[PDB]
Amino acid sequence: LPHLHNGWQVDQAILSEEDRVVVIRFGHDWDPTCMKMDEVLYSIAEKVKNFAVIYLVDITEVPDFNKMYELYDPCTVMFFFRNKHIMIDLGTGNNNKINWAMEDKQEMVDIIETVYRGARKGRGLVVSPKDYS
């Protein structure tokens, strides 16, 4: 899975897609939660490839977003679409990021696909098929 290595690269990545969701994982490869998440993101990448591209960002090597994206969870996954952060209601109370090892591969595809169809349709907000409380 591709990595972004500085702020400029992250900006380039977001600006590189017209018709796909850019999924970013902020964290650390050596981190346990990020390993679980990275496993899932890896195995579903082929499937989401017409509507989604995934990148990893280490938030020590690339600290630029730590304060504003509030990256205080070990593993954060966030969604972008034509340069707009897209939100998902996960029934968690936090609509800006998925911040846990979301173990179910098919569920991740569903969420990523929902975000894509929503963001294309113009919503800045969609809800995950499953409630996660």
Binding site: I14, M68, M78
Partner: peptide, 22 residues
Amino acid sequence: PLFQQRPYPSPGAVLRANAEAS
């Protein structure tokens, strides 16, 4: 509802804001 979570800015805008802060 009242006081709904707002979306974070884009990476470009974040980076620009950091530049502003300096």
